[PDB]
């Protein structure tokens, strides 16, 4: 089980290849093990290992979206890792679940994503503690013509009202313990429904355009007219270039005592299930997450990773540090991928004034016959 | 006039830099110019350009979709390339007018993509000339809870309901000459509210499934059965597979005697502003698109070229080329970025009953309004 002379790694994008390259020489001199990486989009990584892996052309360790995992160990791709205690201290407790499926931890965090709330401190001065509160300054903010509004996020787009829909107790799949039961949706209950009821009474009082798109309510707010904007950190920077210290983020509230918990979205490291050397990949992927790389990860690109114990110098992006700790990862299994369309029609159709149950009924139905065609 | 040392090129893909190795390791014989490749995806690539281009680390010719066109030159990063007669001959006309902005020639077209029609032989016999029988093999073969259908395609998505809601004279931004006018919408024209119209008849009378999403119209069409399915070349190979000689392909038919003209999308290379060396990489360029070189790349990457005089030996593929010849660019300017979600919106409800005028009426005031909100 001794060391082999190469390693070979799948990197997504010329970005963090140059990142990596420069990580992967200090493993070089500790190890004496060389690594070749190569730039695949994490987009078409998958697809390319399933023909490579078998013809010897794979590499050790691949780099994947973690929606992908049922996917990629269903397919005989990805295999488990069996880690230490010790080895996973450090880690987003909910970024490895995200990576974990048949009770098997199939990847590595690198690189997690959450909303969070902006707010303008011009517009509103103090961090909302509550949806009440968020509720309030949307009353008092919101102007019909001046394109001025106290609340914005893209409530037609499920990833972004999810946690406006779906508390604690809610679900999309059913989890008898690890395993998300496909034949048990939770999209319509009674308790989303009632947040879709108030959804929707947002839209009948006017605090959500029904013509802004996610691209406009960026705009809106980059404009000065927008309050509190929920949505990702990837306008972080132009939107500190902005607004200056008037720039507010802070994690998303409680809602009836109850905190909410946005998507988690999560990106990693697999291990091959054609590699020859499994012990030695485990160690570089290790390696490649550990504090020290993934904290100069952090400080070179801005992004929120997968080790609690990294800390950005950037107080807007320590909360999206927090943020990551109180998440719900979005289902890491095929089926999730029938579920988008149809929730996000659903929202659509609330929107325009369409009985919410109603709306989730059909949504939940249309899921269950699309899962049936795709996944007999 | 007088040779660079190296060349800079931009690729999308890792699979399409392995191709381009080996071309330009034959330019670099004839010429003597080396060039260097780098794999940036054409979705990073003008972001990318925007930050080194002017540090002089940007190449000398990049990759973009041909709806990056107006930005890229609005942004000072695309250069003008002036062509030959002679250097044109062979291009898709379509193609290159994709790639002209401000009556300027911005790239040259590499991969070139509509979608056709495709139709399954054991259920339709002959190649539909008309859309009048497309109707009639749809009234034939949809049967209900068989999950039969004689007629798909995902009508809820504007890129594939187009070429069934615009015929030649309609338009989305009217064309002043070349040059698309972003204050002149034609997408609630009376002709183009008619064609929804008939869309909407089409879900009434039970030929288009509300619930299906393009992944299940795929699955079904797989499954056998639906008789015919209006969708892009992705799938060729998994469908030439599954039914062999049942396979069959034909261009759109003709609705009311005229071309129904599906969206054309183009993918190509660009100039650099920032090159030092603009003659050559011009030179690069043309080597890159010249007929020998594209008919190699349709053959090993089995994908549809800019170039009209490249033949691919599949027939399946020699569909999509004749249809890339009849078709309709999508507009290439930034205010294009507005059009697509109203419309999805608007065909969403067009597929859940809404009045279809009011639909299209609703989504063009909206347009117009996310214009003036994005574009001031
Ligand atoms: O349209 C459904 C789509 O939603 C999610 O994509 C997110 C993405 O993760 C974020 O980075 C950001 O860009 O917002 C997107 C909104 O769609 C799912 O992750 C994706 O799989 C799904 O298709
Ligand atoms: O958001 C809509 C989207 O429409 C077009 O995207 C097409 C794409 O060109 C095809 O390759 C195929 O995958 O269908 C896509 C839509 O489902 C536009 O090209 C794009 O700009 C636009 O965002
Ligand atoms: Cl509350
Ligand atoms: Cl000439
Ligand atoms: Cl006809
Ligand atoms: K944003
Ligand atoms: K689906
Ligand atoms: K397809
Ligand atoms: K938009």
Known sequence: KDKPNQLTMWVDGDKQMAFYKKITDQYTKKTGIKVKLVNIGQNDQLENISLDAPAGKGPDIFFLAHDNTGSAYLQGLAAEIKLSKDELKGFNKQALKAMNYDNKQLALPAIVETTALFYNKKLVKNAPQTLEEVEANAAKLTDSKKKQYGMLFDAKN????????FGNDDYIFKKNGSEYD?????????????????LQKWYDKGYLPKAATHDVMIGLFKEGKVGQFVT?????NEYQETFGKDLGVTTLPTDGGKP??????????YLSEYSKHKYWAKDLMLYITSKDTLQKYTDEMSEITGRVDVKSSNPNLKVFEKQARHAEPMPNIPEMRQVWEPMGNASIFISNGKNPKQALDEATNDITQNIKILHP
Chains 1, 2 share one sequence.
């Open 232 to 236: 990702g950190p990837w306008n972080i």
């Open 158 to 165: 499920f990833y972004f009202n999810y946690p406006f829909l």
């Open 182 to 198: 496909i034949h048990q949706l939770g999209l319509n209950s009674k308790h989303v429904v009632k947040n879709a009821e108030r």
């Open 260 to 269: 909410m918990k946005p998507f988690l979205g999560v990106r990693g490291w």
